[PDB]
Amino acid sequence: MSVGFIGAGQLAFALAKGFTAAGVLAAHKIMASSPDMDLATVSALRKMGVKLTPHNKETVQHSDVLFLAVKPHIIPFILDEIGADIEDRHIVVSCAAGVTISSIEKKLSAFRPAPRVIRCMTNTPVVVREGATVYATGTHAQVEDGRLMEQLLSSVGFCTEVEEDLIDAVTGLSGSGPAYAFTALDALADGGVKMGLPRRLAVRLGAQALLGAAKMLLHSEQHPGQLKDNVSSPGGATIHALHVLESGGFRSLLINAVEASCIRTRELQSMAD
Amino acid sequence: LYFQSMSVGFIGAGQLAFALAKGFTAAGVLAAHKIMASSPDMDLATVSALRKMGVKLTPHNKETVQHSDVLFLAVKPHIIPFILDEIGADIEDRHIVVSCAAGVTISSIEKKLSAFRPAPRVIRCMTNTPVVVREGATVYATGTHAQVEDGRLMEQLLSSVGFCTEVEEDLIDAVTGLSGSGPAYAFTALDALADGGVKMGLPRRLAVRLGAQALLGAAKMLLHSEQHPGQLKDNVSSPGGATIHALHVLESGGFRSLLINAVEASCIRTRELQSMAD
Amino acid sequence: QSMSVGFIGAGQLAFALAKGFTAAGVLAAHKIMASSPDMDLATVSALRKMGVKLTPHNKETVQHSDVLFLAVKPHIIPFILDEIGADIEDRHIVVSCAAGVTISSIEKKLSAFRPAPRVIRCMTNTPVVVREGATVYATGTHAQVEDGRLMEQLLSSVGFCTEVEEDLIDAVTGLSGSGPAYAFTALDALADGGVKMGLPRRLAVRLGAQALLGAAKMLLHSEQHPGQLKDNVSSPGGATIHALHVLESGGFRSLLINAVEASCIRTRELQSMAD
Amino acid sequence: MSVGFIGAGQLAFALAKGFTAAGVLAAHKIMASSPDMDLATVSALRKMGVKLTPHNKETVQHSDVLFLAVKPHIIPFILDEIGADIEDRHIVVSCAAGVTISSIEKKLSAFRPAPRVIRCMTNTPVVVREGATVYATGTHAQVEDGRLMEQLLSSVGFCTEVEEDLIDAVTGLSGSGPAYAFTALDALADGGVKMGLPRRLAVRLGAQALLGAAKMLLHSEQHPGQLKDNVSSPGGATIHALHVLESGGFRSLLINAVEASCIRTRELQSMAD
Amino acid sequence: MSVGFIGAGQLAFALAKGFTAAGVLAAHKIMASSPDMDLATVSALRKMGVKLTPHNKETVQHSDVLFLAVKPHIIPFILDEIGADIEDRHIVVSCAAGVTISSIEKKLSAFRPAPRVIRCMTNTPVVVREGATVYATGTHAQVEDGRLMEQLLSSVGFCTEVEEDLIDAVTGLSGSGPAYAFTALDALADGGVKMGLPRRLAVRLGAQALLGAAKMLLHSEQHPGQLKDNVSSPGGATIHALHVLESGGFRSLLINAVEASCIRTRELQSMAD
């Protein structure tokens, strides 16, 4: 099976790297296109052995599964350019935030009546095969298309099917989530440096703390509040730190973040539903 | 590497003793029957879980000492001096005493134990609960009389359950504020992120899973990257997009400063927990 | 049984305990004596109507009693101990209810008169008046083995009761001793919220109080974490999660932590005698 | 009399558990339907003796009193599915937040002209028979229908009839109220842990303090401010703690919460009135 | 003339790079010592051609002007180790924050009576020859020693003599100042990205804006408030942005920062004055 990426940015690189590292795809069975071959993401794809072309039509012609890994406002232009090149064999997988299946189908149906469309929301940790991916299947997607998508994206992280109307909320949580974590890790490392740790050790310890806690929750049947309770001895260091987080409304900031990203995603839709 | 078939004891049968015993046995580096733990309270859920693993339990701290080669002190800091007075006369040349208590200095432990035998082998460590899934973060410092192999043995043992490295002892209070308390900051964050997912229409179970996977993957990316966390953050955010809108609202609440406050507060409290004279 | 109980002090807590004990059927009111320097208090008039014996003389209360509750303010305790110390007999169990006042300080004062006073320290709260109190106690140096068991049987008749190490009692004061006032504040505000949204005040008070009672009962009867029970209330996108967000934005959780901390710290400052 | 639940989520389970514990209904006279009852409630309902079915039409056929215990946006789908199966004997009891009687009657009247509809707002503590429930009777409810509703729901807590236009406000107060209490208890327990208490004891004491204070107010003729005044000695621990609550605007946060839940409830209405 | 660095960290690298780029020193006339030759700063010094040694005594023996480029708490250990190796020819230049001339002289005078000591406070932009440096001369510094110091440090930026009691305040302003600017530039770039700019363009524009404004002030006789007034048209974009800075107390945060760094510097003194 052949996979193509229209777009050669961060997400295209991340998925190609994860897929090849998972061994589910050989790099030479992957083609990516970009109007700008000066991006550092483009240089990395070449070293992997991925085929690169400036022409989106070559990617379509090479590919069976076609990832649209461009910005939401770029999607309509891509569909207009390649719509006449879509064949019965194609599964079109849109990764753009906010852009609906119905808007993609409407554009592509002007060329051929039953395009097979899947919408996904994934995130950059697919590059280390620890992504979080959801997908929704379109009107003309065959039942085996969703199954194929799930097999492919499970090789690079968690993957599950969702109703499409949950995907904007997923974007606010796991799509944007890694950036909340990178911010948190930078700040935790600054806190370690303030208290006397070298910066490189502080970054390592903070990231290991967050990785281990996340793994504990994924493997636990217990509520995150119970795991939190297990860390704190009474009167101790951890509960003193949890108080100062609470006094700043830490929980509310993270709710604000998921909400803000989800609401912005709804504003990003570029085409008519 | 180092060949073991050695006995491990825990004075204390609470969360950390359970976490370390579970991690060590899951790593395959220790058999559960080579582990003994003592506790004044055999009603704890950690005590019942240790029994099912096959760990030996006893109310008598002296039995744990007599059973053990490596002796973890996994009790609260203010309990450490009482333990040392109780079992100091039972410490033998073979023993490596590993204190896990926050804030308690090597010198205070050596001073207490040297009243009984002159050159106690003492290691201080700071570890955290994710050793239970073999993804702990551990640092250690070796005491005055630690033998040449004692630090290497400690590092081999604790590396089987996560990251482990030697540090100067005067960094351990700061490590406590960062990776010792750190999992609780993450559990708080994951609860709140899941609440945000629920507010925006996700089922709670899905929201918890996605948020935890997002944090796990981001942490793995940074551990495997040569890039600054700010550069990885820049890579997530498309211009004008959803992520940068969310990052602004985090900044407006002083999110970064809250996490600095937390590391600072835990570290400062740790300095107050020292129970004995250095 | 034969047990005679005395209260030195006839204020809110003496009334609440006497009312709870008599409603529980564990004490007849005529087996209770209370003393107060001020028989104008409404608590004193209520005790009289219950059938409790009242006297201005703390010494009469001591002579009447087997179990002697010191239900006066912390700074009043040393004065009581000096006044009645010579009247303490071997049969007496002295139960101090005052916030912050340590067993050792009471024993030191009383041992000047007789060498092995039987002292218990307790921290209880006003809901003993409806037999839903929260009480902890710690036993002193000379408490007999049966003294703690007797006090737990007595105080369990009016709510939750358990033994604790004495060094936890200041923290308990900040949590369940002061806790009912945090709840009364919360219920007044929740009722104001109901009124703002159009409910009659009497209905709003009833619904808010029933909501808090039912939630607390659920947690007491559940093996689940309070966070899981919270998750069970909130449907995705729904009314409850929108309200929880506005609580979080104001730092609601931190205010309640601040309150427990402030009450506990103040309790440590109230100790009036040398330990 | 037979009772049915369309919906097998948290609220249906709580009502079924409460009713069976009250002894007012035998569990085998209760049927519940859900297309996916994957919560442990299936084992608990079975252990209770509740009949389970995936087909909402079977629940209607079994039932005299029919509780609609699904999400507000699901109500119209349920009414479309079962509307032709409603008989003269049925009392339809909607539990969904925000959904008006008139909207339900309009949907059901496309099938039969005088549906007997009750709207209720209850809460999860019915599971321990300490719920807070209000109800309003619809246009065609017989006078005995309201009496039956009140007898049934009083067996599991407080119950009173209200004008329908109060129910959104009730939702903000006693519907959402238990979650405010669970948050408060988690935080109060954190405060106990900070000051040196073991977590399990702190949770027990905080919950008992809340329970007892609420019972005092329910049995008192006094204002809650007077009961608050009775707790505080002058200069003492309690008044110091109340000051720090006031300094954070504690009262205003709870007012904000009731308002926010009530306003959101008004937005949840899914059908035309 | 020979220059030595005890310490091979960020500041030693920055000064060596600036000095060699200024052409005032050949890299082979510079020696640096460090107990840790695994630092990335150590690797860069080797490529420049700077001599490296693990032994601080070799640096002293090689050098005439000796920079102590170690942490404040490390200073006393260095002085004890090399005190007996100081010769009449040596000028000892301490770069450590907070550590006083008198404390250094007292340590070194146990070995030889009149050590020539200079205290300086410089910053990392010496690496691009745009540093800000102040210095104070010690008790036994010859008048030509201060002149030499000023000639050397002026080749890599601004340099002026100050009374020693101003140096902690200078540390809070220009010593720590570059970090305030790096923070500000990261945030300004995030603001550009929020409004639709690519990140690399936003970083470039923000840094050019700050560079140009700083150059304008250095070349102007006008107050910074007058230059600020010249940017804003009435009712325009800039004055709207200045309002939101003012509403957040922007000015006060920067005063807080200088103050906090200065106060911490006073706490860093490791030796008795």
Ligand SMILES: O=C(O)CCc1nccs1
């Ligand atoms: O909160 C505390 O005081 C315990 C901190 C830790 N002690 C040992 C590992 S983490």
Ligand SMILES: O=C(O)CCc1nccs1
């Ligand atoms: O910040 C944005 O708008 C991109 C969000 C994502 N798009 C695709 C995966 S995550």
Ligand SMILES: O=C(O)CCc1nccs1
């Ligand atoms: O949070 C929501 O939207 C559900 C509110 C309630 N619905 C029924 C009982 S309480």
Ligand SMILES: O=C(O)CCc1nccs1
């Ligand atoms: O507010 C105070 O200082 C009294 C606290 C309590 N004392 C006894 C029960 S509750």
Ligand SMILES: O=C(O)CCc1nccs1
């Ligand atoms: O403050 C304004 O509205 C003027 C902004 C600028 N106009 C031209 C260059 S900078």
